[PDB]
Amino acid sequence: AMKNLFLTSSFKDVVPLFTEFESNLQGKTVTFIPTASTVEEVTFYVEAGKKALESLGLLVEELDIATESLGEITTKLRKNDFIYVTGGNTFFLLQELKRTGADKLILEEIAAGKLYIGESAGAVITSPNIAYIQTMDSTKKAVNLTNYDALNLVDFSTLPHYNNTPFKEITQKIVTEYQIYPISNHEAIFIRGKEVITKRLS
């Protein structure tokens, strides 16, 4: 029904675009999902994003889909105002969302009007299918995921870090090979229903 999404390559690089997107943040709560990052070896974006949210007066509540009961997943997703998904390995993220059936719970919340913030991997899973991201994120880390169909919230396939080192050749080759929607580190996509707008911080 409703669809409020903020998609980014790097949340810490576009904080002002987020505050342009959404007002009266003080005291609002965020379900913060770092699952994609838990199989990654370099993860500065996780704390950078969390501290950025906190600097806006948001109350951040962690939810690791990989380890928490469905009871806790259901409760947190329902309770908190926003959903935020950190970057990391997109395949592991989608794998854990499907395994728990939480992909469904996220879609329901979004349909009810809940704001979804997706960073890199968290943006990629809004696409119909994440196969296109396999040259950036290794499938070796998702040993159970048998189908790359994702949330299918938008018809387009967000490609983060576009023409941004160290993903220059990677992102270039993806465009060539594959409705790819490229965004750089300082771009965000504002989505309010059918209204889709790219903004750049510069």
Euclidean distance between CA atoms 86 and 88, whole angstroms: 7
The reported resolution of this PDB entry, expressed in Å, is 1.5
* Secondary structure (3-state) at 58: coil
Q: How many CB atoms lie within 10 A of CB 33?
A: 28
The end-to-end CA distance of the chain, in Å, is 33
Q: Which of 120, 127, 157, 184 is catalytic?
A: 120
The CATH number of domain 1-202 is 3.10.129.10: no
Residues in the chain: 202
Q: What residues are paired with 152 via a beta bridge?
A: none
Q: How many CB atoms lie within 10 A of CB 50?
A: 20
Single-letter code of the amino acid located at 30: V
Q: Which of 37, 157, 161, 184 is catalytic?
A: 161
User: Which residue shows structure tokens 């911080």?
Assistant: 201
Euclidean distance between CA atoms 74 and 31, whole angstroms: 11
Euclidean distance between CA atoms 199 and 202, whole angstroms: 10
Q: Is 120 part of the annotated catalytic residue set?
A: yes
Cα distances (angstroms) measured from residue 92 to each of 16, 88, 107, 167: 29, 8, 18, 20
**Solved by what technique?**
X-ray
Instruction: Give the DSSP H/E element, type plus range, for residue 182.
Output: strand 180-182
Three-state DSSP string of 88-147: CCHHHHHHHHHHHCHHHHHHHHHHCCCEEEEECHHHHCCCCECHHHCCCCCHHHCCCCCC
Beta strands 187-192 and 195-200 are antiparallel
Euclidean distance between CA atoms 158 and 4, whole angstroms: 16
Euclidean distance between CA atoms 77 and 65, whole angstroms: 11
Burial class of residue 200 (count of CB atoms within 10 Å of its CB; 0-12, 13-18, 19+): exposed
Euclidean distance between CA atoms 47 and 52, whole angstroms: 8
Q: State both tokens at 98.
A: 């499907």
Domain ranges in the chain? Answer: 1-202
Contact 122, 33 (CB under 8 A): yes
